[PDB]
Structure 1
Amino acid sequence: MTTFRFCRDCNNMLYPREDKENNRLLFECRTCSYVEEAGSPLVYRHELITNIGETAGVVQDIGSDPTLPRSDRECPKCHSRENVFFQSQQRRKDTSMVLFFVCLSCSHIFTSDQKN
């Protein structure tokens, strides 16, 4: 997973370059003389289809939203029976109807799909 690297001088992103006589990769800033040594042959990455598990999104202070439903399911960690539950907040067309539960006390996230 390629990460942007900024020059330590002027915060500009570092462009790759090659060293033929030593055959090694370096990152240089086109505005200044800073040169740093590349730690991996991985500089860029272009994935096509996202195999990302669906995420509940923002969770902070979600228990104060009064338009969000409730349930009496039991917490797997703190053994509490009060929690908030909602569907996946990522708006893809093909998302399944798998729930997400956020516990009221310990703020623990879990799902209704207990696949082993």
Structure 2
Amino acid sequence: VGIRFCQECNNMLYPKEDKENRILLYACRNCDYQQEADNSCIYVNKITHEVDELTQIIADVSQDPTLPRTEDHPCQKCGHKEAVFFQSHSARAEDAMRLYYVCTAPHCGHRWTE
């Protein structure tokens, strides 16, 4: 889910098995640094790639003059009537033809997909 970096030689940690206690042990394999972690996860893979597109949409897209604007869908936590809607149109998104709405008010980067 995430790997920290070495405190001694600034390299990348890697999993290692120890027989003294049988606990997960992230060990840097360049130097001899040792570290015990608590996440207890090594590798996760999104096979159907259900990645939340709402986080990857940049909140500053709402001021693009080339994007359409409609007042039909108002902002949820902002209350502004008009907003900017678009499609992601990217790979690893299956159909990728469902609208994502971004509020156009300044200092409000709320994105909802409806």
**Common fold by TM > 0.5:** yes
Does the alignment pair 1:72 with 2:71? Answer: yes
| Mapping 1:76-87, distance limit 5 Å | 76-87=76-87
| C-alpha distance 87-45 of structure 1, shift in aligned 2 (>3 A) | closer
Cα 1:39–1:89 shift into 2, 3 Å: same
Whether the aligned pair in 2 keeps the contact of 1:56 and 1:100 (CA below 8 Å) is: no
Choose 1 or 2 for highest CA Rg. 1
Q: Counterpart of 2:97? A: 97
Q: Is 2:14 aligned against 1:12?
A: no
Question: What TM-score do you get using the length of structure 2 for normalisation?
Answer: 0.73
| Structure 1 residues without counterparts, runs of 5 or longer | none
Residue 107 (structure 1) aligned with residue 106 (structure 2): no
Q: Quick check: which one's helix share is greater?
A: 2
TM-score, L = length of structure 1: 0.72
Unaligned runs of 5+ in 2: none
How far does the alpha carbon of each residue in 1:1-22 deviate from its partner, in whole angstroms, 9 at most, with x for none? x312211111111222222133
Sequence identity, in percent?
Answer: 44
Residue 47 (structure 1) shift: 4.3
Superposed CA RMSD: 2.6
Alignment check: 8 A CA contact 2:89 2:97 kept: no
Query: Shift of residue 68 of structure 1?
Result: 0.7
